[PDB]
C-alpha cells in the first residue's frame, strides 16, 4: 500500500527510516552566481539528490511526460518579457512571481516527500524562504504593487507555515559589479537588460532579512566566489555541523506522519495558492479560463487519469 | 403510452452515445419519428377515454397536447443548434438531455391518471426549465428570471400538494376516473373556500393569472430560444389542463368563487394588450401577448360551459403553435443584430423577403383571422362569455381591436419602412430557419382544415 | 512509456479484479438459489405445488 | 412530598440559574455545573434510601463518576482557553458567530 | 492526534450512541450520552486552533447543561413512579424537562445558536460527524418516549426551527454555517412529524443523513469552505459542481428528487391527523432553504466565476484520496423517489 | 409507532419465519430493475468522479455495483411486502372483530337518493 494511517499503525516510522545524513540543504545567492555548480557538487560529494532551481514548467516536468507544456497552459508568464518590459500593464511581473512561488512550494514538497520516503538528503538550488527577495526587489523598483505584495504575504503565510525549514543554508556572496560582469559575459540580452538597482535590492533583501531570519532557525554558511569554487571545503564544513537547533530534533513519529500525509498530496500542498483574492494581475476571466481549460483537456495524456489514457497507449482500461 | 415513453428514454442514451457531429441529426430524426408515433393518439372515442393501464390514460384533451409536445421537440433542436455552435460536445449533449427530460416529464404529465402523480411530474418540469434558463441564457437577468419563475410556481403549488393529500384522505382516492364518478357538491363553507383556493391558485399561477404574471416576461425574455419555445407553447398549458381536470370536484363553489378571477382575467387581458402596444422590446411584446391569450383561456375555464371548454382547448393549441413561431422569428432577427430592441432593425422586408412573408403569416394568425383555429377558439370563448353576460362582449371586442393593433404594429415596425443604414451584416435567411418557420405554420392551417381534432372532449 | 512517473493505476490490480468478479458471481448464484428456495417454500406452505 | 425534596430541587434550580447566567469567569460556571450534580446526587440518594430500592444504591456513585469526567473535560477546555487568551473570560470566545 | 487514538475515540463516540440506542434503563441512556460527549470533544479539537478550542468549549457547555437537565428529569420521574425503564413518563414536569434537554441536544430552536457556531469552528470532517451522529442519538430517545411528548411544545419548537434555519441560511455566506442552518431546518421537520409517526421521523432522518453526507463529502473533495472558494471548482473538476448542484436541488425538496419524499410523507401524515395550517406553513417556509441552496448553486455550477493563474498547476495534478461511498450517497440522495413504499420496510 | 411492539415480534429480525408464506418477488420485478439502474448510475458516477472513461472503464466495478444493488433490493422488497401483508391482515382482523364499529349499511340506489341540482349558467 501507499503511505497512510494503516501503514503508520503497521509500523512505518520516519525516525526509523532516517539515517542521520537526511539533511535538507539549500544553496542561495544573487542572480548569476555559482550556486548551481556548488549545489551540484554538494549533492554529488555528499551522496544527496540534486534539485535544480524550480523555474516555470517544473510542474510540467514532474507530471505526465517530462516535456514542458505550452506557456499559455503552464504559467502564462514570461521571464524574458519581465526583463524586456518590467513595468508591463498586464501584471506579467507579479504573475511570474506568484507562479514561481507556487513552483518552489511544489518542489519543496517533492523534496520533503523524497527525504521522508527514502531517507536520502536533498540539495535545493533555492527554496520557499528565499523566494521573497525577488518580491522585495520588484516592489522597491516599482514593478509590482502593494496589493501584490500583500497577496504574496498572505499565501506565503498560510502555505510555508506548514513545512520544516532547511537543515543547512549555504549562501554564496558575489558583489554586484561582479554579477554584472558575469551577466555581460553570458551574453543573454534579456538578463543583460537587468539594471544594477534591481541586483542591489536582491542582495539587500538577502543580507538584511533572509540571512538574519535563517540564523535563528539553524546555522548559515556564507562563502565568497573563491570559497564557493572549492566545494571540498564546503562539504567538509557541512559534514562537521553537528549542532542542530531546528525543529527536526523536536520532530516525532506522529509529526512526521502528519508531514508525510501532507507532502504526498500535491493538491493539498497547493490548496491556498488559489485563494479568491481578485488582483487584476492574476485573475483570469470566465471565458479565457474555459478556453484554456478546454485546451489543456485536449492535450494528449491529460483528458483522463494517468492510467486511463487510451490515446497514449494505455490498455486494459475496461478492467482497471 | 409506453410505446411513446420508452423511445424518449432511448433518445437519452442515443444522444450520449452518438458521435460529436451527429448529435443534432440523430436527435432531430428520432424526435420526428416519435412525433409521428404519437400522432396515433388522436383516434379518440366519443364516450370515454383511452385507459391504457392503471397509471396512464389519454383523452381528447390530453392527445393534442401530447402531439404538440412531441412536435415541438425537434423544432427546439433546430433553433438550439442555430445558437449553440461554439459549445463543447458535452455541453451540447447536456442541453439536448435537458430538452429530452422536459419532453418526458411533459408526456407523463399529460397522461398521468392520478392527481398526485400529475403533481409530481408537473412540478418535475421545473428543474430542466430552470437549468436551461439560468445556464444557457445570454444576459445577466437570467438568474433573477429563474428565481422569479421557480418561486412563483412553488408558492402556487405547495398548497396544492396539501389540498391533494387532504382530498385523498377524505375520499380515499385521487384517481381522476374515481373522483369524476364519485364527485359530491362542495358546500359553501370557509374550509371549502380555502380548498378551492389552494387548487385554483396553483394553476392560476402556472397560467398565469393577471397580477401573478411578472415571472412570465422575466423568464420568457431571458431564456434561450428553446426555453422560450417550450415555456410559451407547452408549459403555460399545464395550468389550463390542470384547471380543466381539477374543477370536477369544485362545484358548485366555482359559481361563486370565479368572480375575482374572471374580473382579473378580463381587465388584465385589456391591460396586457395595451402594454403590448407600448413595448420597446420584441420578446417582451410576444410574452405579453401570451399573457393576454391565457387570460382568455382562464375566462373560458372559469365560466365552465361545454362551448367554453372547446374554445379553451382550441385556443391553447393555436397559441402554442403561434407563440413558438413568433419567438423563432424574433430569435432569427436577434441572431442577426444581437439586440432585442424592436426599432433597431427595420426594412427587413427589403433585406429578407421570405422572412417577411413568415412574419406576415405569424402575425395574421396571432390576431384572430378566420378561419384559423386561433379565431375558432377565441370565438367559442366569446360566445360562451356572451351567454354568461352581455358586457363580456364589450371587453372581448376591445381586446380583439387592441390585439390587431399591436400585432400589425410589430409587423410594420420590424419589416416595413427603410432599413437601418449602418446594419450591414444581414445575411440571407438560412434553409434551416425557413424550414423551421414552415414546420411551425403548415400544421396550423391543416388543423384549420380538420378542427374537431383540437376541440377537446366536449365536442 | 508516456509518463515520466509510473501511474498508480498503470496495470490492473489482478487480486482486486478477481475478488470483484468472484463476489459478483457469488452474489448472483446466491440470489438465484435464494429465489428458488423462496418459491418452493411459498408453494409448499400454501399447498399449491 | 416533604420539604426536604423541595429544598433540594430549589438548590438544583438555583445552580441551574447560576450556570445559565455567566459573569466573566469560566471557572465560576464550572463550579455552578458541579453544584448541579451534587444536588442531583443528594436528591437521588434521598429518593432511593427512603424507598429501600436496594439495587439502586449504586446509581449515585455512577452519577459521581460521570460528574468527575465532566469536570475533568471542562478543566481541560479551560486550560486550553486560558493558554490561548491569557484569561478564562468568556468574552474571548467570540470568534465564532451565529 | 495519533491514528490509533483517533479511531478509538471515534469508536467510543459510536459506542456511547449505541448504548443510548440499545439500553432500556434511563441511567444507561444517560451514561451513553456522557460517554458520547466525552469522546466527542477531542474529535472537535483534533486540529488545534483557537476557533476549534472555542467551538469545543461552547459544545461542551451546551451538552453538559442538557445532560444535567436530562438527569434531573429522570430523577423527577423516578420520584413519582419508582420506574427506571424508558417508557411514557409519569410526570408532566419531568416530561417538559426531558423535552427541553433533548431539544437542546439536537439544536432545535430556541436552542440553535451553538449549531452554526460550532460547525463553523470545526473542520469539515468534524462537522459531518457532528451533524450526522449527534442528531442520530437524541432522536432515537425521543422516538422511544414519543407517546408522552407534549404536541404543543414539540410543534412550537419544530416551527421555530424551520423559520430560524431558513432565515439564518438566507444571511450566511460560509458553507459550514449554511450546512448548520440547513440542519436546524431539517431537524425542525423531523420533530414536527415526531408526535404522529416515528416511522416518518426515521425516514426523514435517513434521507437527511444521506444528503448531508453527500454534500459534506463533496465539500471535502473540493476543499471549499466559502462561496468564493467553491466558485473556483468549475475550472478544476466540473463534475463535482454538477453533482453538488443536483444534490442542492434534492435538499431543497424539488420533485422528483429524493428530498421531496420526506416532506411529502410528513405533510400527508400530518394531514391524516387533521393538521392543515402547520403543514402549509412548514411547506411554504422551506422556500427560504430552497432560495439559499439556489444562491449557492448559481455561484458554483450555473455560472462561471473568475479563476486564478495557479489553477493551471492544479489542473496538472490529480486528486489522490478517494471518498468512501460518495457515488452511492450521490445516487441515494437524488434518485430514490420511485422507491418510496420501502418506508414500510423501515416501519 | 403503529406496528412496533406488535405481539410475537422478534427484535432485530429483518425477515421473520412467517414471511416465507408470501410470494417472493419475481427476479424481473420493475423495482429490482430500478435498483439495478441505481447501481449502474452509481458506477458511472464513480468513473466520472475518479476521471476514468465513464462508460468503458471499470466493467468489473460496475458489475459489482449493479449486483450489490439488486441483492439488497431483493431483500428490501421482501421485507416491504411482508410489512404490507401484515398491515392488511391486522386491519381485516380488527374489522371482523368489531362489527359494531364497522357495520354493513343498506345500499340505496340513485333512484331513491335525492341530490340537490346546481345549474351551471
Ligand atoms: C399555401 C401556404 C401559405 C403559407 C406559406 C407561404 C409560403 C410562401 O412563401 O409562399 C410564397 C411563394 C411564392 O414565391 P415568391 O413570391 O417568390 O415568394 C417570395 C415572397 O414570399 C412573396 O411574398 P408574398 O407577399 O407574395 O406572399 C403571398 C402570400 C404568402 O402567404 C400566404 O400564402 C399565407 C396565407 C395564409 C395566411 C395566414 C392564415 C390566415 C387564416 C386562414 C387559415 C386557413 C387557410 C385555409 C386552409 C389551408 C390548409 C393548408 O401572402 C398573401 O398573399 C397574403 C394572404 C393574406 C390572407 C388572405 C385572406 C385570408 C384567407 C381567406 C380564405 C381562407 C380559406 C377558406 C375559404 C372558405 C371558402 C372556400 O410560394 C411558393 O413558392 C409555393 C411553393 C411552396 C409551397 C407549395 C409546395 C408544393 C405542394 C402544393 C400541394 C401540397 C399538397 C399535396 C398535393 C399532391 C398532388
Ligand atoms: C479494531 C476495531 C475495528 C477497526 C476498524 C478499522 C478502523 C481504523 C482504521 C484506521 O487506522 O484508520 C485511521 C484513521 C485515522 O487516521 P488519520 O490520518 O488520523 O485520519 C485522517 C482523516 O480521516 C482525514 O479526513 P478524511 O477526509 O479522510 O475523513 C475520513 C472520515 C472521517 O469521518 C468519519 O470517520 C465519519 C464517521 C461516521 C459519520 C456518520 C456516518 C453515517 C451515520 C449514520 C448511518 C445511518 C444508517 O470521513 C469519511 O471517510 C467520510 C465518508 C465515510 C462515511 C460514510 C458513512 C456511510 C454510512 O481512522 C479513521 O478513519 C477512523 C475510523 C473509525 C471507524 C470506527 C467504526 C468502524
Ligand atoms: C443514459 C444517458 C443519460 C440519461 C440520464 C437520465 C438520468 C440518469 C441519472 C444518472 C446518470 C448516470 C451518471 C452519469 C454521469 C456522467 C458524468 C459525466 O462525466 O458525463 C459526461 C460523460 C462523457 O464526458 P466525459 O468524457 O466524462 O467528460 C466530462 C468533462 O466534464 C467534459 O468537460 P466539459 O467542461 O465540457 O464538461 C462540463 C460538464 C460536465 O458535467 C457533467 O458531465 C455532469 C452531468 C450531470 C451530473 C450527474 C447528475 C446525476 C443525478 C441525476 C440527474 C441526471 C440528469 C442528467 C443526466 C446526465 C447524464 C450524463 O459540466 C457542465 O457543462 C455544467 C453544466 C451544469 C448544468 C447541467 C448538469 C446537471 C444536469 C442534471 C440536473 C437535472 C436533473 C433533473 C431531474 C430528473 C433527473 C432524471 O457522459 C457519459 O459518459 C454519458 C453517460 C451515459 C452513457 C450511455 C449509457 C447507456 C449506454 C447504452 C445502454 C443501452 C441499454 C439497452 C437498450 C436496448 C438495446 C440494446
Ligand atoms: C452485499 C449485498 C449488499 C449489502 C449492502 C448492505 C447495505 C444495507 C445494510 C443492511 C441494513 C439493514 C440491516 C439488516 C439486518 C438487521 C435486521 C434489523 O435491523 O432489521 C429490522 C430493522 O431494520 C431497519 O429498521 C429497516 C431496514 C430497511 C432500511 C432501508 C430502506 C429505508 C427506506 C428508504 C426508502 C427509499 C430508498 C429505497 C432504498 C434505495 C429489525 O427491526 P427492529 O429491531 O425491531 O427495529 C426496532 C426499531 N424500530 C422498531 C423503531 C424500527
Ligand atoms: C398572512 C395571511 C395569509 C393568508 C393566505 C393563506 C396562505 C398562508 C397559509 C396558512 C394557512 C391558511 C389557512 C388554511 C385553511 C385551513 O387550514 O383549513 C382549510 C380546510 C379545513 O380543514 P379541516 O380541519 O378538516 O376543517 C373541517 C371542519 N370541520 O382544509 C382544507 O380544505 C385543505 C386546504 C389546504 C389549505 C390551503 C391554504 C390556503 C391558501 C390559499 C392558496 C393561495 C396561495 C397561492 C400562492 C400564489 C402566489 C404565487
Ligand atoms: C465484541 C465483544 C463482544 C460483543 C458482545 C455482543 C454485543 C452485546 C453488547 C455488549 C455485551 C457485553 C457482555 C458484557 C455483559 C456481561 C453481563 C453478565 O452477564 O454478568 C456476568 C458476566 O460474566 C463476566 O464476568 C463477564 C466479565 C467481562 C469482563 C471483560 C469485558 C470486556 C469489556 C471490554 C471493554 C470495551 C469497552 C466497551 C465500550 C463501552 C460500552 C459500550 C455474569 O454474572 P453471573 O453471576 O454469572 O449471573 C448469574 C447469577 N448467578
Ligand atoms: C394592497 C392590497 C392589494 C390587493 C389587490 C387585490 C386585487 C383585486 C382582486 C379581486 C378583484 C375582483 C374582486 C371581486 C370580488 O370582490 O368578488 C367577490 C366574490 C363574490 O362574493 P359575493 O358577491 O359576496 O357572493 C355572494 C353571493 N351573492 O367573492 C368570492 O368570490 C369569494 C372570495 C374569492 C377571492 C379569494 C382570494 C383570491 C383573490 C384573487 C386572486 C389573488 C391573487 C391575484 C391578484 C393579484 C395579486 C398581485
Ligand atoms: C456491506 C457493506 C457495503 C458497503 C461497502 C463499501 C466498500 C467500498 C467503499 C469505497 C467506495 C466504493 C468503491 C469504489 C472503488 C474503490 C477502489 C477499487 O478499485 O475498489 C475495487 C473494488 C472491488 O471489490 P472488492 O473489494 O473485491 O469487493 C469486496 C470483496 N470482499 O470495487 C468495489 O468494491 C466497487 C463496488 C462497491 C460496492 C457498491 C457500493 C455499495 C453498494 C451498497 C448496496 C446497497 C444499497 C444501499 C447502500 C447504503 C449505504 C451503504
Ligand atoms: C457491464 C456493466 C454492468 C451491467 C451488468 C448487468 C448484468 C445483468 C445480468 C445478471 C446475470 C443474469 C442472470 O442471472 O439472469 C437470471 C435472471 C433472469 O430473469 P428470469 O426471472 O430468470 O427470467 C424469466 C422471465 N424473463 O436475471 C434477472 O432476473 C436479472 C434482472 C434484475 C435486474 C438486473 C439489472 C437491470 C439492468 C440495470 C442496468 C445495467 C445494464 C446496463 C448496460 C449498459 C451497456 C453499455
Ligand atoms: N522569483 C523570481 N522572480 C523573477 N526572476 C527569477 C526568480 N527566480 C529566478 N529568477 C530568474 O531565473 C534566472 C536563474 O538564474 P540563476 O540560476 O540565478 O543563474 P546561475 O545558474 O548562474 O546561478 C535568473 O535570470 C533570475 O532572474
Amino acid at each position: 500500500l501507499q503511505y497512510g494511517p494503516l501503514a503508520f499503525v503497521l509500523g512505518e516510522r520516519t525516525t526509523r527510516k532516517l539515517t542521520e545524513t537526511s539533511k535538507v540543504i539549500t544553496v542561495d545567492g544573487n542572480i548569476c552566481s555559482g550556486k548551481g555548480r556548488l549545489a551540484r557538487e554538494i549533492a554529488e560529494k555528499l551522496g544527496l539528490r540534486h534539485f535544480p532551481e524550480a523555474g516555470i514548467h517544473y510542474a510540467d516536468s514532474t507530471t505526465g511526460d517530462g516535456k514542458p507544456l505550452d506557456v499559455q497552459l503552464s504559467g502564462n508568464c514570461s521571464l524574458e518579457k519581465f526583463y524586456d518590459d518590467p513595468k508591463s500593464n498586464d501584471g506579467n511581473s507579479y504573475r511570474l512571481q506568484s507562479w514561481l512561488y507556487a513552483s518552489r512550494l511544489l518542489q519543496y514538497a517533492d523534496a520533503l516527500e523524497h527525504l521522508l520516503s527514502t531517507g536520502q538528503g536533498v540539495v535545493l538550488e533555492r527554496s520557499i524562504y528565499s523566494d521573497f527577495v525577488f518580491l522585495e526587489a520588484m516592489y522597491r523598483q516599482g514593478f509590482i504593487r502593494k496589493q501584490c505584495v500583500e497577496h504574496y504575504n498572505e499565501v506565503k503565510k498560510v502555505t510555508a507555515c506548514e513545512y520544516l525549514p532547511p537543515h543547512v543554508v549555504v549562501y554564496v556572496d558575489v558583489p554586484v559589479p561582479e554579477i554584472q560582469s558575469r551577466i555581460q559575459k553570458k551574453g543573454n540580452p534579456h538578463e543583460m537588460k537587468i539594471t544594477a538597482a534591481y541586483l542591489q535590492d536582491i542582495e539587500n533583501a538577502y543580507k538584511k532579512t533572509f540571512l538574519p531570519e535563517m540564523s535563528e532557525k539553524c546555522e548559515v554558511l556564507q562563502y565568497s566566489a573563491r570559497e564557493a569554487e572549492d566545494a571540498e571545503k564546503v562539504v567538509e564544513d557541512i559534514e562537521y555541523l553537528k549542532c542542530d537547533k531546528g525543529p527536526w530534533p523536536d520532530q516525532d513519529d506522529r509529526t512526521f506522519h502528519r508531514l508525510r500525509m501532507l507532502v504526498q498530496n500535491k493538491l493539498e500542498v497547493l490548496n491556498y495558492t488559489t485563494i479568491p483574492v481578485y488582483l487584476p494581475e492574476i485573475t483570469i476571466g470566465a471565458h479565457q479560463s474555459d478556453r484554456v481549460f478546454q485546451k489543456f483537456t485536449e492535450l494528449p495524456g491529460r483528458k483522463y487519469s494517468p492510467g486511463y489514457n487510451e490515446d497514449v497507449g494505455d490498455k486494459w482500461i475496461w478492467l482497471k | 403510452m409506453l410505446k411513446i415513453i420508452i423511445p424518449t428514454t432511448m433518445l437519452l442514451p442515443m444522444t450520449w452515445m452518438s458521435k460529436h457531429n451527429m448529435i443534432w441529426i440523430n436527435a432531430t430524426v428520432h424526435s420526428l419519428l416519435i412525433s409521428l408515433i404519437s400522432l396515433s393518439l388522436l383516434n379518440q372515442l366519443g364516450e370515454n377515454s383511452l385507459n391504457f393501464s392503471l397509471t396512464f390514460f389519454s383523452d381528447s384533451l390530453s392527445a393534442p397536447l401530447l402531439v404538440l409536445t412531441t412536435w415541438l421537440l425537434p423544432l427546439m433542436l433546430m433553433a438550439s443548434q442555430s445558437h449553440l455552435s461554439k459549445e463543447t460536445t458535452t455541453r451540447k449533449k447536456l442541453y439536448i438531455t435537458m430538452l429530452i427530460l422536459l419532453q418526458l416529464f411533459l408526456i407523463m404529465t399529460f397522461t398521468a391518471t392520478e392527481l398526485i402523480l400529475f403533481y409530481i411530474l408537473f412540478e418535475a418540469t421545473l428543474v430542466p426549465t430552470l437549468i436551461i434558463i439560468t445556464r444557457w441564457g445570454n444576459q445577466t437577468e437570467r438568474l433573477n428570471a429563474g428565481l422569479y419563475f421557480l418561486f412563483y410556481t412553488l408558492a402556487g403549488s405547495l398548497p396544492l400538494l396539501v389540498a391533494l393529500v387532504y382530498i385523498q384522505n377524505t375520499t380515499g382516492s385521487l384517481n381522476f376516473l374515481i373522483i369524476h364518478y364519485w364527485s359530491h357538491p362542495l358546500s359553501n363553507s370557509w374550509s371549502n373556500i380555502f380548498m378551492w383556493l389552494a387548487c385554483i391558485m396553483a394553476f392560476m399561477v402556472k397560467m398565469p393569472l393577471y397580477g401573478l404574471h411578472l415571472w412570465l416576461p422575466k423568464a420568457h425574455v431571458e431564456a434561450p430560444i428553446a426555453g422560450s419555445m417550450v415555456l410559451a407553447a407547452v408549459l403555460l398549458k399545464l395550468g389550463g389542463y390542470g384547471m380543466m381536470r381539477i374543477t370536477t370536484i369544485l362545484n358548485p363553489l366555482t359559481n361563486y368563487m370565479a368572480y375575482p378571477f374572471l374580473m382579473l382575467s378580463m381587465w388584465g387581458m385589456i391591460m396586457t394588450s395595451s402594454i403590448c402596444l407600448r413595448q420597446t422590446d420584441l420578446k417582451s411584446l410576444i410574452a405579453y401577448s401570451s399573457v393576454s391569450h391565457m387570460a382568455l383561456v382562464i375566462v373560458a375555464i372559469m365560466i365552465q360551459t361545454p362551448w367554453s371548454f372547446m374554445g379553451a382547448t382550441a385556443l391553447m393549441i393555436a397559441h402554442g403553435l403561434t407563440s413558438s413561431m413568433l419567438f423563432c422569428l424574433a430569435n432569427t432577427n436577434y441572431e442577426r443584430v444581437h439586440s432585442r430592441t424592436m426599432i433597431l432593425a427595420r426594412g427587413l422586408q427589403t433585406l429578407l423577403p421570405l422572412m417577411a412573408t413568415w412574419w406576415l403569416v405569424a402575425s395574421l394568425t396571432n390576431l384572430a383571422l378566420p378561419p384559423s383555429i386561433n379565431l375558432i377558439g377565441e370565438l367559442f370563448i366569446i360566445t360562451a362569455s356572451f351567454s354568461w353576460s352581455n358586457i363580456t362582449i364589450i371587453l372581448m371586442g376591445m381586446n380583439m381591436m387592441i390585439t390587431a393593433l399591436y400585432s400589425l404594429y410589430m409587423l410594420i415596425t420590424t419589416q416595413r419602412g427603410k432599413y437601418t443604414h449602418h446594419i450591414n451584416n444581414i445575411k440571407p435567411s438560412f434553409t434551416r430557419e425557413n424550414a423551421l418557420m414552415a414546420l411551425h405554420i403548415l400544421p396550423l392551417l391543416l388543423l384549420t382544415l380538420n378542427p374537431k381534432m383540437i376541440l377537446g372532449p366536449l365536442y | 512509456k508516456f509518463y515520466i512517473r509510473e501511474p498508480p493505476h498503470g496495470s490492473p490490480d489482478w487480486l482486486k479484479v478477481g475478488l470483484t468478479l468472484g463476489t459478483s458471481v457469488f452474489l448472483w448464484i446466491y440470489l438465484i438459489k435464494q429465489h428458488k428456495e423462496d418459491v418452493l417454500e411459498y408453494k409448499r406452505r400454501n399447498g399449491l405445488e | 412530598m416533604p420539604l426536604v425534596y423541595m429544598n433540594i430541587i430549589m438548590a438544583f434550580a438555583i445552580a441551574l440559574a447560576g450556570l445559565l447566567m455567566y459573569r466573566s469567569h469560566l471557572m465560576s460556571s464550572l463550579l455552578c455545573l458541579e453544584g448541579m450534580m451534587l444536588s442531583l446526587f443528594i436528591m437521588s440518594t434521598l429518593i432511593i434510601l427512603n424507598t429501600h430500592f436496594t439495587l439502586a444504591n449504586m446509581m449515585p456513585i455512577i452519577l459521581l463518576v460521570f460528574a468527575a469526567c465532566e469536570a475533568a473535560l471542562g478543566l481541560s477546555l479551560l486550560v486550553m482557553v486560558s493558554n490561548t487568551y491569557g484569561t478564562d473570560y468568556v468574552q474571548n470566545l467570540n470568534l465564532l458567530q451565529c | 492526534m495519533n491514528p490509533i487514538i483517533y479511531t478509538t475515540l471515534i469508536m467510543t463516540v459510536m459506542s456511547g450512541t449505541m448504548l443510548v440506542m440499545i439500553s432500556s434503563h434511563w441511567l444507561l441512556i444517560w451514561i451513553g450520552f456522557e460517554m458520547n460527549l466525552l469522546a466527542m470533544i477531542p474529535v472537535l479539537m483534533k486540529n488545534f486552533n483557537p476557533r476549534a478550542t472555542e467551538a469545543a468549549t461552547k459544545y461542551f457547555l451546551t451538552q453538559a447543561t442538557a445532560s444535567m437537565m436530562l438527569m434531573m428529569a429522570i430523577i423527577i420521574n423516578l420520584l413519582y413512579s419508582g420506574q427506571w425503564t424508558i417508557t411514557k413518563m409519569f410526570n408532566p414536569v419531568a416530561m417538559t424537562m426531558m423535552t427541553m434537554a433533548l431539544a437542546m441536544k439536537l439544536g432545535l430552536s430556541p436552542f440553535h445558536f451553538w449549531v452554526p457556531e460550532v460547525t463553523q469552528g470545526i473542520s469539515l470532517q468534524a462537522g459531518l460527524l457532528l451533524l450526522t451522529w449527534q442528531k442520530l442519538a437524541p432522536l432515537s430517545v425521543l422516538c422511544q418516549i414519543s407517546q408522552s411528548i407534549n404536541p404543543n411544545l414539540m410543534l412550537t419548537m419544530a416551527m421555530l426551527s424551520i423559520l430560524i434555519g431558513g432565515w439564518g441560511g438566507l444571511n450566511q455566506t460560509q458553507l459550514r454555517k449554511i450546512m448548520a442552518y440547513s440542519s436546524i431546518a431539517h431537524m425542525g421537520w423531523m420533530t414536527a412529524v415526531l408526535p404522529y409517526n416515528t416511522t416518518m421521523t426515521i425516514l426523514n432522518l435517513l434521507i437527511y443523513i444521506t444528503m448531508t453526507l453527500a454534500m459534506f463529502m463533496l465539500l471535502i473533495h473540493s476543499s471549499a469552505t466559502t462561496t468564493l472558494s467553491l466558485s473556483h471548482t468549475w475550472n478544476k473538476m466540473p463534475v463535482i459542481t454538477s453533482l453538488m448542484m443536483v444534490t442542492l436541488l434534492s435538499m431543497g425538496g424539488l420533485p422528483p428528487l429524493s428530498g421531496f419524499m420526506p416532506k411529502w410523507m410528513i405533510i400527508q401524515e400530518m394531514t391524516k391527523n387533521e393538521s392543515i395550517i402547520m403543514p402549509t406553513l412548514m411547506a411554504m417556509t422551506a422556500l427560504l432553504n430552497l432560495y439559499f441552496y439556489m444562491r449557492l448553486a448559481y455561484s458554483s455550477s450555473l455560472t462561471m466565476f473568475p479563476s486564478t493563474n495557479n489553477m493551471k498547476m492544479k489542473w496538472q495534478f490529480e486528486h489522490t484520496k478517494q471518498m468512501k461511498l460518495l457515488p452511492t450517497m450521490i445516487v441515494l440522495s437524488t434518485l430514490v423517489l420511485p422507491m418510496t413504499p420501502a418506508l414500510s420496510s423501515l416501519n | 409507532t403503529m406496528m412496533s411492539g406488535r405481539p410475537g415480534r422478534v427484535p432485530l429480525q429483518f425477515l421473520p419465519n412467517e414471511a416465507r408464506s408470501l410470494p417472493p418477488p419475481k427476479l424481473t420485478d420493475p423495482r429490482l430493475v430500478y435498483m439495478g439502474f441505481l447501481g449502474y448510475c452509481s458506477g458511472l458516477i464513480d468513473n466520472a468522479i475518479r476521471r476514468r472513461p465513464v462508460v468503458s472503464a471499470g466493467l468489473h466495478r460496475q458489475l459489482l455495483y449493479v449486483t450489490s444493488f439488486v441483492f439488497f433490493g431483493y431483500y428490501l422488497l421482501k421485507r416491504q411486502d411482508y410489512m404490507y401483508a401484515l398491515r392488511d391482515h391486522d386491519m381485516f382482523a380488527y374489522v371482523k372483530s368489531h362489527p359494531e364499529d364497522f357495520p354493513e349499511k343498506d345500499k340505496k340506489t340513485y333512484g331513491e337518493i335525492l341530490e340537490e341540482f346546481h345549474p351551471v349558467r
Side-chain angles (χ1 to χ4, degrees), chain A residues 295-313:
Chain A
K295 209 180 308 301
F296 185 97
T297 303
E298 292 170 3
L299 280 179
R302 303 289 188 165
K303 191 181 178 182
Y304 303 114
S305 282
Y308 301 91
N309 279 279
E310 203 178 31
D311 58 355
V312 304

Side-chain angles (χ1 to χ4, degrees), chain B residues 197 201 209-212 256-257 259-261 263-264:
Chain B
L197 275 173
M201 285 308 296
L209 181 66
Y210 180 78
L212 304 171
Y256 150 84
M257 293 283 305
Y259 275 96
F261 300 94
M263 295 316 120
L264 284 173

